[PDB]
Amino acid sequence: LPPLGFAIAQLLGIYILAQAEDSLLLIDMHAAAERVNYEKMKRQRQENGNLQSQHLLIPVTFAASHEECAALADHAETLAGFGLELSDMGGNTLAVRAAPVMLGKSDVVSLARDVLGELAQVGASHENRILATMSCHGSIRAGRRLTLPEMNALLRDMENTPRSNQCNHGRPTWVKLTLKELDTLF
Protein backbone atom coordinates (compact mmCIF):
# COMPACT_ATOMS: atom_id res chain seq x y z
CA LEU A 1 0.00 0.00 0.00
CA PRO A 2 1.75 3.18 -1.28
CA PRO A 3 -0.32 5.65 0.76
CA LEU A 4 -1.08 9.36 0.66
CA GLY A 5 2.22 9.91 2.43
CA PHE A 6 4.43 8.83 5.29
CA ALA A 7 4.32 11.27 8.19
CA ILE A 8 7.74 12.69 9.02
CA ALA A 9 7.09 15.48 11.54
CA GLN A 10 5.06 18.42 12.88
CA LEU A 11 4.95 21.97 11.51
CA LEU A 12 4.94 24.72 14.14
CA GLY A 13 1.58 23.72 15.60
CA ILE A 14 -1.19 23.09 13.06
CA TYR A 15 0.31 21.13 10.14
CA ILE A 16 1.66 17.58 9.93
CA LEU A 17 4.18 17.00 7.15
CA ALA A 18 4.51 13.61 5.48
CA GLN A 19 7.01 12.43 2.87
CA ALA A 20 5.80 10.41 -0.13
CA GLU A 21 7.03 9.55 -3.62
CA ASP A 22 6.17 13.11 -4.72
CA SER A 23 7.23 15.49 -1.92
CA LEU A 24 6.42 16.48 1.65
CA LEU A 25 2.71 17.09 2.18
CA LEU A 26 1.21 19.51 4.72
CA ILE A 27 -1.93 17.99 6.23
CA ASP A 28 -4.03 20.40 8.28
CA MET A 29 -4.39 18.01 11.20
CA HIS A 30 -7.48 19.57 12.79
CA ALA A 31 -9.38 19.94 9.50
CA ALA A 32 -8.54 16.48 8.11
CA ALA A 33 -9.20 14.86 11.48
CA GLU A 34 -12.53 16.70 11.73
CA ARG A 35 -13.48 15.29 8.32
CA VAL A 36 -12.45 11.75 9.24
CA ASN A 37 -14.06 11.94 12.70
CA TYR A 38 -17.35 13.13 11.22
CA GLU A 39 -17.18 10.32 8.66
CA LYS A 40 -16.35 7.60 11.20
CA MET A 41 -18.94 8.83 13.70
CA LYS A 42 -21.69 8.81 11.07
CA ARG A 43 -20.59 5.37 9.85
CA GLN A 44 -20.72 4.11 13.45
CA ARG A 45 -24.11 5.83 13.87
CA GLN A 46 -25.86 4.31 10.85
CA GLU A 47 -24.68 0.96 12.28
CA ASN A 48 -25.47 -0.26 15.82
CA GLY A 49 -27.41 2.98 16.31
CA ASN A 50 -24.96 4.50 18.81
CA LEU A 51 -21.45 5.88 19.17
CA GLN A 52 -18.66 3.92 20.83
CA SER A 53 -18.23 4.97 24.48
CA GLN A 54 -15.36 4.86 26.97
CA HIS A 55 -15.10 5.64 30.59
CA LEU A 56 -12.38 7.27 32.30
CA LEU A 57 -10.63 8.32 35.48
CA ILE A 58 -11.02 11.86 36.81
CA PRO A 59 -14.48 13.26 35.91
CA VAL A 60 -14.73 16.78 34.63
CA THR A 61 -16.59 19.24 36.96
CA PHE A 62 -19.17 20.22 34.35
CA ALA A 63 -20.96 23.17 36.11
CA ALA A 64 -24.15 22.32 34.22
CA SER A 65 -26.46 25.31 33.54
CA HIS A 66 -29.94 24.95 35.10
CA GLU A 67 -32.08 23.43 32.35
CA GLU A 68 -29.29 21.13 31.12
CA CYS A 69 -29.75 19.14 34.33
CA ALA A 70 -33.43 18.71 33.42
CA ALA A 71 -32.35 17.74 29.89
CA LEU A 72 -30.29 15.00 31.52
CA ALA A 73 -33.42 14.16 33.52
CA ASP A 74 -35.04 13.69 30.12
CA HIS A 75 -34.15 10.28 28.71
CA ALA A 76 -30.35 9.94 28.85
CA GLU A 77 -30.67 6.95 26.50
CA THR A 78 -29.91 9.27 23.58
CA LEU A 79 -26.88 10.59 25.47
CA ALA A 80 -25.69 7.00 25.83
CA GLY A 81 -26.31 6.76 22.08
CA PHE A 82 -23.88 9.65 21.51
CA GLY A 83 -21.24 7.93 23.65
CA LEU A 84 -21.63 10.45 26.49
CA GLU A 85 -22.77 9.04 29.83
CA LEU A 86 -22.71 11.57 32.66
CA SER A 87 -24.03 11.89 36.20
CA ASP A 88 -25.47 14.62 38.42
CA MET A 89 -23.39 15.64 41.44
CA GLY A 90 -25.92 17.93 43.14
CA GLY A 91 -27.45 21.37 42.86
CA ASN A 92 -26.85 22.23 39.21
CA THR A 93 -23.56 20.51 38.38
CA LEU A 94 -22.65 17.37 36.46
CA ALA A 95 -19.64 15.23 35.57
CA VAL A 96 -19.07 12.93 32.60
CA ARG A 97 -18.38 9.30 33.51
CA ALA A 98 -17.92 8.20 29.89
CA ALA A 99 -16.83 10.05 26.75
CA PRO A 100 -17.01 8.78 23.16
CA VAL A 101 -13.84 7.21 21.81
CA MET A 102 -12.45 8.78 18.57
CA LEU A 103 -12.30 12.14 20.40
CA GLY A 104 -11.05 11.94 24.01
CA LYS A 105 -7.93 13.81 25.08
CA SER A 106 -9.52 16.96 26.59
CA ASP A 107 -12.44 19.37 26.91
CA VAL A 108 -15.12 16.64 27.09
CA VAL A 109 -17.18 19.31 28.86
CA SER A 110 -17.65 21.03 25.49
CA LEU A 111 -18.91 17.85 23.79
CA ALA A 112 -21.30 17.02 26.63
CA ARG A 113 -22.49 20.63 26.80
CA ASP A 114 -23.17 20.71 23.05
CA VAL A 115 -25.19 17.49 23.04
CA LEU A 116 -26.97 18.28 26.33
CA GLY A 117 -27.99 21.77 25.24
CA GLU A 118 -29.22 20.08 22.08
CA LEU A 119 -31.38 17.85 24.31
CA ALA A 120 -33.56 20.91 24.95
CA GLN A 121 -36.59 21.19 22.65
CA VAL A 122 -37.19 17.51 21.97
CA GLY A 123 -38.61 16.99 18.49
CA ALA A 124 -33.25 14.65 17.75
CA SER A 125 -34.99 14.75 14.34
CA HIS A 126 -31.92 16.54 12.94
CA GLU A 127 -28.96 14.25 13.79
CA ASN A 128 -26.61 16.74 12.11
CA ARG A 129 -25.20 17.83 15.41
CA ILE A 130 -22.69 14.95 15.06
CA LEU A 131 -20.85 17.35 12.73
CA ALA A 132 -18.27 19.99 13.75
CA THR A 133 -20.62 20.77 16.65
CA MET A 134 -20.02 17.27 18.04
CA SER A 135 -16.75 17.17 16.10
CA CYS A 136 -15.72 20.19 18.18
CA HIS A 137 -12.72 18.13 19.22
CA GLY A 138 -11.20 17.07 15.89
CA SER A 139 -7.64 16.00 16.52
CA ILE A 140 -5.28 17.82 18.85
CA ARG A 141 -6.02 21.53 18.52
CA ALA A 142 -2.43 22.78 18.63
CA GLY A 143 -0.62 20.49 21.06
CA ARG A 144 1.29 17.30 20.26
CA ARG A 145 0.60 14.30 18.01
CA LEU A 146 2.97 11.81 19.71
CA THR A 147 6.41 10.70 18.49
CA LEU A 148 5.23 9.63 14.93
CA PRO A 149 3.93 6.02 15.34
CA GLU A 150 0.48 7.54 15.44
CA MET A 151 0.96 10.33 12.88
CA ASN A 152 0.77 7.82 10.03
CA ALA A 153 -2.55 6.68 11.51
CA LEU A 154 -4.06 10.09 10.74
CA LEU A 155 -2.17 9.97 7.43
CA ARG A 156 -4.49 6.99 6.78
CA ASP A 157 -7.52 9.30 7.20
CA MET A 158 -9.03 9.19 3.71
CA GLU A 159 -8.40 5.52 2.94
CA ASN A 160 -11.85 3.86 2.98
CA THR A 161 -13.44 7.16 4.13
CA PRO A 162 -15.00 9.47 1.50
CA ARG A 163 -15.33 13.27 1.32
CA SER A 164 -11.59 13.90 1.03
CA ASN A 165 -10.80 16.67 -1.46
CA GLN A 166 -13.41 19.29 -0.54
CA CYS A 167 -13.53 20.05 3.19
CA ASN A 168 -16.48 21.52 5.12
CA HIS A 169 -16.00 24.72 3.06
CA GLY A 170 -13.70 23.81 0.16
CA ARG A 171 -10.39 24.73 1.76
CA PRO A 172 -7.67 22.14 1.02
CA THR A 173 -6.40 20.03 3.90
CA TRP A 174 -3.22 18.63 2.26
CA VAL A 175 -0.60 18.85 -0.49
CA LYS A 176 0.50 22.03 -2.23
CA LEU A 177 4.27 21.52 -2.61
CA THR A 178 5.80 19.13 -5.14
CA LEU A 179 9.37 17.96 -5.72
CA LYS A 180 9.86 21.18 -7.73
CA GLU A 181 10.15 23.44 -4.69
CA LEU A 182 13.67 24.35 -5.87
CA ASP A 183 12.08 27.42 -7.49
CA THR A 184 11.61 28.73 -3.95
CA LEU A 185 15.42 28.68 -3.63
CA PHE A 186 15.70 31.56 -6.13
Place this chain on the structure above:
Amino acid sequence: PPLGFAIAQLLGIYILAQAEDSLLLIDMHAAAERVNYEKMKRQRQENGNLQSQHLLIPVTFAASHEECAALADHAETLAGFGLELSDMGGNTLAVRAAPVMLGKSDVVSLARDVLGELAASHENRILATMSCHGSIRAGRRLTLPEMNALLRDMENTPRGRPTWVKLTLKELDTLF
Protein backbone atom coordinates in the same frame (compact mmCIF):
# COMPACT_ATOMS: atom_id res chain seq x y z
CA PRO B 1 -15.96 3.41 60.21
CA PRO B 2 -18.55 2.14 59.97
CA LEU B 3 -21.41 4.46 61.07
CA GLY B 4 -19.23 7.47 60.23
CA PHE B 5 -16.99 9.91 62.07
CA ALA B 6 -18.63 12.67 64.10
CA ILE B 7 -17.93 16.16 62.78
CA ALA B 8 -20.43 18.43 64.59
CA GLN B 9 -23.89 18.70 66.13
CA LEU B 10 -27.18 20.14 64.85
CA LEU B 11 -28.78 22.71 67.17
CA GLY B 12 -28.61 20.46 70.22
CA ILE B 13 -30.30 17.13 69.46
CA TYR B 14 -28.35 15.75 66.48
CA ILE B 15 -24.79 14.65 65.96
CA LEU B 16 -23.81 14.41 62.29
CA ALA B 17 -21.09 11.90 61.45
CA GLN B 18 -19.13 11.84 58.19
CA ALA B 19 -18.76 8.47 56.47
CA GLU B 20 -17.76 7.28 53.01
CA ASP B 21 -21.45 7.34 52.07
CA SER B 22 -22.57 10.68 53.54
CA LEU B 23 -23.10 12.40 56.88
CA LEU B 24 -25.53 10.64 59.22
CA LEU B 25 -27.79 12.42 61.73
CA ILE B 26 -27.68 10.51 65.02
CA ASP B 27 -30.33 11.29 67.64
CA MET B 28 -27.80 11.48 70.45
CA HIS B 29 -30.29 11.24 73.32
CA ALA B 30 -32.10 8.24 71.80
CA ALA B 31 -28.83 6.55 70.83
CA ALA B 32 -27.43 7.03 74.33
CA GLU B 33 -30.70 5.80 75.85
CA ARG B 34 -30.46 2.61 73.78
CA VAL B 35 -26.77 2.07 74.55
CA ASN B 36 -27.30 2.71 78.28
CA TYR B 37 -30.26 0.30 78.32
CA GLU B 38 -28.13 -2.39 76.68
CA LYS B 39 -25.15 -1.72 78.97
CA MET B 40 -27.32 -1.80 82.10
CA LYS B 41 -28.98 -5.08 81.10
CA ARG B 42 -25.58 -6.59 80.29
CA GLN B 43 -24.29 -5.42 83.69
CA ARG B 44 -27.50 -6.77 85.27
CA GLN B 45 -27.51 -10.38 84.05
CA GLU B 46 -23.83 -10.53 85.04
CA ASN B 47 -22.74 -9.63 88.60
CA GLY B 48 -26.43 -9.30 89.50
CA ASN B 49 -26.20 -5.55 90.11
CA LEU B 50 -25.16 -2.24 88.56
CA GLN B 51 -21.91 -0.46 89.35
CA SER B 52 -22.41 2.03 92.18
CA GLN B 53 -20.57 5.33 92.62
CA HIS B 54 -20.48 7.39 95.79
CA LEU B 55 -20.67 11.13 95.17
CA LEU B 56 -19.97 14.36 97.02
CA ILE B 57 -22.73 16.70 98.28
CA PRO B 58 -25.73 14.35 97.96
CA VAL B 59 -29.04 15.69 96.64
CA THR B 60 -32.08 15.44 98.91
CA PHE B 61 -35.40 14.72 97.20
CA ALA B 62 -38.66 15.46 99.05
CA ALA B 63 -39.57 11.83 99.70
CA SER B 64 -43.34 11.43 99.95
CA HIS B 65 -44.39 9.62 103.10
CA GLU B 66 -44.91 6.08 101.80
CA GLU B 67 -41.68 6.28 99.78
CA CYS B 68 -39.76 6.48 103.07
CA ALA B 69 -41.44 3.23 104.12
CA ALA B 70 -40.55 1.82 100.70
CA LEU B 71 -36.95 2.64 101.61
CA ALA B 72 -37.64 0.82 104.88
CA ASP B 73 -38.57 -2.06 102.61
CA HIS B 74 -35.42 -3.87 101.49
CA ALA B 75 -33.00 -1.27 100.13
CA GLU B 76 -30.76 -3.99 98.67
CA THR B 77 -32.86 -3.76 95.49
CA LEU B 78 -31.92 -0.08 95.26
CA ALA B 79 -28.27 -1.02 95.82
CA GLY B 80 -28.71 -3.59 93.05
CA PHE B 81 -29.64 -0.72 90.73
CA GLY B 82 -26.54 1.13 91.95
CA LEU B 83 -28.62 3.49 94.11
CA GLU B 84 -27.65 3.82 97.78
CA LEU B 85 -29.73 6.42 99.59
CA SER B 86 -30.32 7.31 103.24
CA ASP B 87 -33.01 9.08 105.25
CA MET B 88 -32.04 12.52 106.55
CA GLY B 89 -35.10 12.97 108.77
CA GLY B 90 -38.75 13.99 108.75
CA ASN B 91 -39.83 12.66 105.36
CA THR B 92 -36.80 13.38 103.17
CA LEU B 93 -34.03 11.22 101.67
CA ALA B 94 -30.71 11.68 99.86
CA VAL B 95 -28.68 9.53 97.45
CA ARG B 96 -25.27 8.79 98.92
CA ALA B 97 -24.50 6.87 95.70
CA ALA B 98 -25.69 6.88 92.09
CA PRO B 99 -25.12 4.40 89.25
CA VAL B 100 -22.22 4.96 86.88
CA MET B 101 -22.98 5.28 83.14
CA LEU B 102 -25.64 7.74 84.32
CA GLY B 103 -23.69 9.86 86.83
CA LYS B 104 -24.61 13.54 86.68
CA SER B 105 -28.37 13.93 86.23
CA ASP B 106 -31.57 14.67 88.07
CA VAL B 107 -30.60 11.72 90.26
CA VAL B 108 -33.79 12.44 92.19
CA SER B 109 -35.72 11.31 89.10
CA LEU B 110 -33.98 7.92 88.85
CA ALA B 111 -34.28 7.33 92.59
CA ARG B 112 -37.94 8.37 92.52
CA ASP B 113 -38.75 6.02 89.64
CA VAL B 114 -37.10 3.01 91.29
CA LEU B 115 -38.58 3.90 94.70
CA GLY B 116 -42.14 4.48 93.46
CA GLU B 117 -41.97 1.17 91.64
CA LEU B 118 -41.89 -0.38 95.16
CA ALA B 119 -45.68 -0.13 95.60
CA ALA B 120 -42.78 -6.88 93.98
CA SER B 121 -41.32 -8.95 91.13
CA HIS B 122 -40.82 -7.35 87.66
CA GLU B 123 -37.43 -6.52 86.15
CA ASN B 124 -37.86 -4.05 83.27
CA ARG B 125 -37.88 -0.76 85.06
CA ILE B 126 -34.21 -0.64 84.03
CA LEU B 127 -35.45 0.48 80.58
CA ALA B 128 -36.26 4.08 79.54
CA THR B 129 -37.84 4.47 82.99
CA MET B 130 -34.34 4.00 84.42
CA SER B 131 -32.93 5.39 81.16
CA CYS B 132 -34.97 8.55 81.95
CA HIS B 133 -31.51 10.04 82.04
CA GLY B 134 -30.05 8.86 78.71
CA SER B 135 -27.34 11.25 77.66
CA ILE B 136 -27.47 14.89 78.65
CA ARG B 137 -30.90 15.89 77.40
CA ALA B 138 -30.36 18.66 74.84
CA GLY B 139 -27.23 20.55 75.96
CA ARG B 140 -23.54 20.21 76.77
CA ARG B 141 -23.13 18.00 73.77
CA LEU B 142 -19.53 17.03 74.60
CA THR B 143 -17.18 17.65 71.72
CA LEU B 144 -16.09 15.51 68.78
CA PRO B 145 -13.61 13.15 70.55
CA GLU B 146 -16.27 11.70 72.87
CA MET B 147 -18.80 12.30 70.09
CA ASN B 148 -17.11 9.40 68.28
CA ALA B 149 -17.39 7.31 71.45
CA LEU B 150 -21.13 7.98 71.32
CA LEU B 151 -20.94 7.05 67.60
CA ARG B 152 -19.84 3.61 68.80
CA ASP B 153 -23.34 3.15 70.28
CA MET B 154 -24.61 0.12 68.35
CA GLU B 155 -21.10 -1.32 68.26
CA ASN B 156 -21.06 -4.15 70.86
CA THR B 157 -24.78 -3.52 71.50
CA PRO B 158 -27.88 -4.87 69.71
CA ARG B 159 -31.42 -3.41 69.83
CA GLY B 160 -38.60 2.62 69.35
CA ARG B 161 -37.64 5.23 66.76
CA PRO B 162 -34.56 4.76 64.54
CA THR B 163 -31.58 6.89 65.54
CA TRP B 164 -29.68 7.49 62.27
CA VAL B 165 -29.39 8.16 58.56
CA LYS B 166 -31.76 10.23 56.48
CA LEU B 167 -29.30 12.17 54.28
CA THR B 168 -29.56 10.79 50.74
CA LEU B 169 -29.66 14.22 49.07
CA LYS B 170 -33.32 14.26 50.07
CA GLU B 171 -32.47 17.63 51.58
CA LEU B 172 -31.41 18.38 48.00
CA ASP B 173 -34.97 17.73 46.83
CA THR B 174 -36.12 19.84 49.78
CA LEU B 175 -33.87 22.73 48.64
CA PHE B 176 -33.72 22.30 44.84
